[PDB]
Amino acid sequence: DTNQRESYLREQMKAIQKELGGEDGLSDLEALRKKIEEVGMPEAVKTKALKELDRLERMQQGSPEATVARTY
Amino acid sequence: DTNQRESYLREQMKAIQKELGGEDGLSDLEALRKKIEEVGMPEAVKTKALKELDRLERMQQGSPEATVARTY
Amino acid sequence: DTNQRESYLREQMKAIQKELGGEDGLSDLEALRKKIEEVGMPEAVKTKALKELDRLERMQQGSPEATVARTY
Amino acid sequence: TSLGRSIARSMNRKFHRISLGGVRDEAEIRGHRRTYIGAMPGKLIHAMKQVGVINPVILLDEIDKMSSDWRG
């Protein structure tokens, strides 16, 4: 019961206070967009990079795939 | 209104974060959240502060990682 | 169901560890309350004595933070 | 240790002795982190509880073998 209530609390926590789309996105993902604004990748490189964007969208308190994905 | 839209959910978050990670860490944690803006944090430094704030307050669990983001 | 029973036995480990780490003694509470004042703590130390009193009388035993606040 | 006992006698103080050898973590010099039940103080606090005065004589034992293994 307490772990299920922790599940509702962790979903309201990955829900609220979670406007890091303007923080993690601005630091990393919007940075990726402005870098590929100045980086003309081939379509294979953009294909794997969009698959690595599929490896993104895991937050700081979410999955840790996106941390190594952001460095990469 | 910006303070409202970055504050109202800090009273909602704390309400759902009461004792989460540690009530004793809650007073320190809110001191960190006010000092993230009070002290001259470089936009990026403040940005990593607020991402770790999005990482902290862990309604996942009050784990060692909660103490990690608290000490961060 | 392989990982389901792995997770269920994770829950069994935490459920035995909480009673291994069981500090659910309600016998000391009122005596500790009355000896807060008459064992005269210093200002910082009386301040945290009032703090750890304030962690109790709303949450006492069905929670780890109240039990460790009572232990402290 | 009886040297410390009689020094407690000469100045009318109360003695305590605590063993600190084999302690290579800060979890038993200092306490444990306030995010779970089973948080437990350091040995000095143990001595201080088990002695009955403000200003006791605390005996630090086996301090030649101090080293950093884990927990810093």
Side-chain angles (χ1 to χ4, degrees), chain B:
Chain B
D1 200 6
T2 56
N3 194 16
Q4 156 192 351
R5 295 298 92 196
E6 70 98 21
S7 72
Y8 85 101
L9 73 166
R10 319 297 162 85
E11 69 272 14
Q12 307 304 337
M13 163 273 304
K14 65 172 53 65
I16 72 188
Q17 198 256 350
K18 302 280 72 173
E19 272 72 5
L20 271 299
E23 181 279 339
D24 315 327
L26 164 66
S27 180
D28 171 68
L29 187 153
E30 262 292 324
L32 304 168
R33 192 186 66 77
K34 56 98 175 179
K35 281 189 55 205
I36 284 175
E37 317 179 0
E38 289 182 1
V39 191
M41 298 298 152
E43 299 295 349
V45 162
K46 184 171 181 178
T47 299
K48 75 182 172 188
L50 294 152
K51 300 188 210 78
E52 279 263 7
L53 182 77
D54 293 11
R55 182 186 316 186
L56 187 39
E57 281 84 353
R58 293 268 202 158
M59 282 73 74
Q60 273 74 62
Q61 288 298 326
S63 293
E65 60 85 20
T67 74
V68 166
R70 269 187 292 165
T71 48
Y72 195 102

